[PDB]
């Protein structure tokens, strides 16, 4: 029932909603595991017919983190060690090699398994049935294939009008070269900053949330210091000492919240937007 790649595979506390028809193909549990993002919803409407309960996602990167830590989603470039798959189970390594089209590693794996008794006797069924199942996701994505059943009446853009950026534009090449299911996930996560409509156009946020670079997706504002964001810290080693500094302000008199709590509050979290989307006024045909 689950579509989660991890659920395709010890225990996974897979999100129950991964059993419930939304083709993220991954639980938020594992979006945390490897990427520290949360899937989310944005209902929108004129008259609360609410046709447009669009999916979105937010990161949980720490505001003081720099370098690789800001990369939300690496490109194939250095992905091997951005993920450190070498630390990971062979199943995980195989999955990520499939995603990143590392068929050379796939071959190497199959060769190494070849003479192992654990491959000959058993588990070959497991490996290849799981592989087929996973590939079914590719076969349900990638608009170039899958009955061209990805089309879905609307067309998306990302690298659009990067404020004061110089005349140019790039990285959609790499976007397309990434597995199409990844691109669908990106569409699910990042709503466009603008939408074209048959009649008109609409705007959702004033200023840019994120950037895509050749290295991968990177959380940055266009300019200045990164907007302050404490981690929620609600969720996740002892074999060695682990340490962190943190700056805390240790307030008091907070029971004034007896008064304050009576009034409504506003979110403080991290929606991500990039680029346009377009509903065609007329079919090209």
């Amino acid at each position: 029932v689950n579509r989660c790649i991890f659920a395709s595979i010890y225990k996974s506390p897979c999100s129950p909603d991964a059993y419930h028809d939304d083709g993220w193909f991954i639980c938020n549990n594992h979006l945390i595991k490897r990427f520290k993002m949360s899937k989310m919803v944005l209902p929108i409407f004129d008259e609360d017919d609410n046709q447009f309960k669009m999916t979105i996602a937010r990161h949980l990167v720490g505001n003081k983190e720099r370098g690789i830590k800001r990369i939300l989603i690496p490109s194939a470039t250095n992905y091997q060690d951005v993920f450190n798959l070498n630390s990971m189970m062979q199943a995980e390594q195989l999955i990520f090699h499939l995603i990143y089209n590392n068929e050379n590693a796939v071959n190497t794996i199959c060769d190494n398994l070849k003479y192992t008794e654990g491959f000959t006797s058993n588990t070959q069924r497991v490996i290849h049935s799981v592989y087929a199942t996973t590939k079914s996701i590719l076969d349900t994505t990638n608009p170039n294939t899958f009955c061209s059943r990805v089309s879905r009446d609307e067309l998306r853009f990302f690298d659009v009008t990067n404020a004061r950026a110089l005349r140019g534009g790039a990285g959609d090449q790499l976007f397309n070269n990434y597995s199409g299911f990844l691109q669908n996930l990106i569409r699910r996560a990042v709503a466009p900053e603008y939408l074209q409509i048959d009649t008109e156009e609409l705007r959702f946020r004033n200023c840019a949330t994120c950037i895509i670079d050749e290295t991968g997706l990177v959380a940055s504002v266009p300019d200045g210091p990164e907007l302050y964001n404490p981690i929620r810290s609600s969720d996740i080693q002892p074999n060695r000492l682990q340490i962190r500094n943190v700056l805390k302000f240790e307030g008091d008199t907070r029971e004034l919240d007896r008064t304050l709590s009576g009034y409504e509050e506003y979110p403080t979290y991290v929606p991500l937007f990039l680029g346009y989307q377009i509903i065609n006024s007329e079919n090209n045909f």
Partner: protein, 197 residues
């Protein structure tokens, strides 16, 4: 660097001349009074409103000689740029320029939006720059001028390419859906009880 810009314009001219094969000349250009065309530096063209454009306030002289006053001038970005779409496919296997063109079009659109929003007060600032109320009209020309220089710059960037037989319909669709609202924007330009002007 003026000489360099001239040189590169000559190089674009060479490209044009080589691509074009036929003059089809002597068809009479009855319409055009092409008297004394002149150009000014394209620097600062990424934005607008600077008094550097006002600096040649002497333009009143040429206006009085040959006005070419056009009230309420509007723009057909489609009609302008449409020929240039037939280039990305001369080379193959990349959005070698279209990846840039798309956002450049969107940026031009937003430029039109913003200048439309802003002009309504910038009138007064341009009067400050020069008290001639006639400026109020003559301002508008600069609005186009700026993007004219933008296109003149862009022409240097991509003149290796020659019309494809059949364009990506996506480009056409974009052009239509943007230009419709662009041209609609002019609708709000209006006059209010000037009496017997």
């Amino acid at each position: 660097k003026l000489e360099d810009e001239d040189f590169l314009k000559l190089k674009a001219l060479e490209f044009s001349k080589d691509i074009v094969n036929e003059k089809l000349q002597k068809i009479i250009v009855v319409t055009d009074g092409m008297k004394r065309l002149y150009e000014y530096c394209n620097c600062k063209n990424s934005l607008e409103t600077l008094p550097s454009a006002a600096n040649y306030g002497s333009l009143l002289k040429r206006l009085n000689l040959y006005n070419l006053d056009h009230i309420e001038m509007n723009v057909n970005f489609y009609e302008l740029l449409f020929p240039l779409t037939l280039y990305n496919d001369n080379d193959n296997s990349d959005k070698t320029l279209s990846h840039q063109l798309v956002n450049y079009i969107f940026l031009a659109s937003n430029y039109f939006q913003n200048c439309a929003k802003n002009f309504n007060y910038m009138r007064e600032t341009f009067n400050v720059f020069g008290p001639f109320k006639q400026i109020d009209f003559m301002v508008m020309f600069v609005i186009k001028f700026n993007f004219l220089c933008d296109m003149r710059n862009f022409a240097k960037l991509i003149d290796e390419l020659v019309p494809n037989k059949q364009p990506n319909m996506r480009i056409h669709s974009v052009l239509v859906m943007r230009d419709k609202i662009v041209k609609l924007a002019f609708s709000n330009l209006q006059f209010q009880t000037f009496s017997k002007k």
